[PDB]
Amino acid sequence: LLVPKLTASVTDGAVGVTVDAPVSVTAADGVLAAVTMVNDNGRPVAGRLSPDGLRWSTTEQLGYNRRYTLNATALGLGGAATRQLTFQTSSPAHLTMPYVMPGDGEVVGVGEPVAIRFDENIADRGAAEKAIKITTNPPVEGAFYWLNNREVRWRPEHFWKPGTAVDVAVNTYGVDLGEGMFGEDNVQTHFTIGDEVIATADDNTKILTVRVNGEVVKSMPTSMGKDSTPTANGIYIVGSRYKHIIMDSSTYGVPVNSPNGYRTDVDWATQISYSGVFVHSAPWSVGAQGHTNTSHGCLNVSPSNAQWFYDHVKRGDIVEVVNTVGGTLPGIDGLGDWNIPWDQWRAGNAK
Ligand code: NA
Ligand code: NA
């Protein structure tokens, strides 16, 4: 006749216990007759015992900077055993909150990366990547790449296949993200890839051609950046859209009062770079559209075409610019992810 045995997921006297997982107690050669866990203030922690009496677990989120006391008794035909354990959880120096894009339940285009933006610099990028679980259906290979010290992106080698489900579980609560900075909470999002929409602006023709699943559906005369402030070549991801917006160059590093500065209220504006490129309505340049470049970088189109673009293009669709006198959009722009070669993206930069 064996005495029951108790196995807890913490050890008496432990410090730095992480709260990324529940606390449990298991009985062998007996069943759990009593399990309680209280915090430093005497408040009971919610838990649940399995129907067979063998395993108890906490059922609510456990706190940072706690001292918990666990009491457990097991009974079997061979006798009884009781244990009391006290332990302390992680004490962060700092917290950081993740923000995930795109939005939960959204339908997005074939260029949309998964984005996890933290509100603090992440000292241990590898710990953050490890805590982020990305599910794809149909499953496709992808990889993480950091655009800056706070935001990481995940995407496949090529544009997504329409109809792919994407799930993002950012399981950062209880995780040490370096230098004592712990996740403030978990976050989650799920999204789906819709139709393939790729618009190409060719400086040789000054036409912006929109293709939906490979077919031309719209051909828009455009006026892009003038030679002294050109539109960069490259692949741009569609971001947010606005019925109207005041474009303020100081938002993009350029003082309004300086030679290339501007502040302009425009209609039907679709953002395609963090550096401030938009497709938008430009009634003042309709004469130049299809003929000469006049802007500070934006793709000027007619009011009707800008509204069409707003109505028919969605976040994650693609604009490709070719044959301008500019350089190439930086891969770390914020919407320039696809300009980074796959071998470099795949290798990452977690360090
Ligand atoms: Na993952
Ligand atoms: Na769609």
Author numbering: 57 to 407
Q: What sentences appear in the manuscript?
A:
In M. tuberculosis, the cell wall contains high levels of 3 → 3 (meso-Dap–meso-Dap) cross-links (approx. 80% at stationary phase), which are formed by the l,d-transpeptidases (Ldts) (ESI†).6 Evidence has emerged that LdtMt2, in particular, plays an important role in the virulence of M. tuberculosis, as disruption of the ldtMt2 gene results in altered morphology and inhibition of colony growth. Mechanistically, the Ldts differ from the PBPs through their use of a nucleophilic cysteine rather than serine during catalysis. Several β-lactam antibiotics, in particular carbapenems, have been shown to inhibit the activity of LdtMt2 and to have anti-TB activity. Such LdtMt2 inhibition involves covalent modification of the nucleophilic cysteine (Cys354), which reacts with β-lactam antibiotics to give (a) stable acyl–enzyme complex(es). Consistent with previous reports, the structure of LdtMt2 consists of two N-terminal immunoglobulin fold-related domains and a C-terminal catalytic domain.
To investigate the structural basis of LdtMt2 inhibition by ebselen, we carried out crystallographic studies. A comparison of our structures with reported LdtMt2 complex structures reveals variations in the conformation of the lid depending on the nature of the modification to Cys354. It appears that the hydrophobic residues of the lid (e.g., Tyr308, Met303, Tyr318, Thr320) can adjust to accommodate the group bonded to Cys354, apparently to optimise hydrophobic interactions. These results imply that the lid is conformationally dynamic, with the precise structure observed being related to the nature of modification of the nucleophilic Cys354.
